[PDB]
Amino acid sequence: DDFVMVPAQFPGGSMKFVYKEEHPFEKRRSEGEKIRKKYPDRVPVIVEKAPKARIGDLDKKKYLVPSDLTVGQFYFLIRKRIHLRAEDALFFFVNNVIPPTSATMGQLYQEHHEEDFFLYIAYSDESVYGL
């Protein structure tokens, strides 16, 4: 009867990550399934610098994040890990879009997790992914 109202702001596609190139899909997927069962109130997240970003790199890519943590809290966390200056910008991208700062990480996971059961976030100094 009714139409599915496809959102005007629908995401882009998945993004390339060095992490996905360096860890075979079936190994990631098996790990993701297991970590979701072990910590069901947390979400597994891979965080990587976007292509062409001019910003410090993380020493750790893998984060197990409480599902109620907001995207804003996760920005605050990442800023501190790379000692961003007060005047430095930080943008996240999931499936090519900037996620809402007020979303929870659990909400982002539900909408954007990939087939390996991970959520992938790219970060940048720029507001356009890959620029």
Numbering used by the authors: -13 to 117
Reproduce passages from the article:
Mammalian ATG8 proteins comprise two subfamilies, namely LC3s (LC3A, LC3B, and LC3C) and GABARAPs (GABARAP, GABARAP-L1, and GABARAP-L2). ATG8 proteins promote autophagosome formation, elongation, and closure, as well as fusion with lysosomes. The canonical LIR motif is a small Θ0-X1-X2-Γ3 motif, where Θ represents an aromatic residue (W/F/Y) and Γ an aliphatic residue (L/V/I) (whose side chains bind to hydrophobic pocket 1 (HP1) and HP2 of the LIR docking site (LDS), respectively) and X represents any amino acid (aa). In this study, we examined the molecular determinants that regulate selective binding of the centriolar satellite (CS) marker protein PCM1 (pericentriolar material 1) and the ULK1 complex to GABARAPs.
Our affinity measurements showed that the LIR motifs of ATG13 and ULK1 exhibited very strong binding affinities for GABARAP. In order to find out whether their C-terminal regions are contributing to GABARAP binding in a similar way as observed for PCM1, we determined the crystal structure of ATG13441–454 and ULK1354–366 LIR motifs bound to GABARAP at a resolution of 1.14 and 1.07 Å, respectively. The ATG13 and ULK1 LIR motifs interacted with GABARAP in a very similar way. In the N terminus, the main chain of the aspartate in position X−2 (D442ATG13 and D355ULK1) formed a hydrogen bond with K48GAB from HP1. Within the core LIR sequence (Θ0-X1-X2-Γ3) the interactions were completely identical: (1) the canonical LIR interactions previously described for PCM1 structure, (2) in position X1, a valine (V445ATG13, V358ULK1) was packed against the aromatic ring of Y49GAB, (3) in position X2, a methionine was engaged in a large surface of hydrophobic interactions with L50GAB/Y25GAB, (4) in position Γ3, the carbonyl of the hydrophobic residue formed two hydrogen bonds with the guanidinium group of R28GAB. F364ULK1 in position X7 formed an extended hydrophobic interaction with L55GAB, F62GAB, and L63GAB (similarly to L1961PCM1). This interaction was further stabilized by P365ULK1 in position X8, which was packed against F62GAB side chain and formed hydrophobic contacts with F364ULK1. Thus F364ULK1 was sandwiched between P365ULK1 and L55GAB/F62GAB/ L63GAB. A361ULK1, the corresponding X5 residue in the ULK1 LIR, made hydrophobic contact only with P52GAB. Strikingly, removal of the whole C terminus of the ULK1 LIR motif switched on binding to LC3A and LC3B, suggesting that the proline residue and/or the alanine residue in position X4,5 (P361ULK1 and A362ULK1) may inhibit LC3A and LC3B binding to the ULK1 LIR motif.
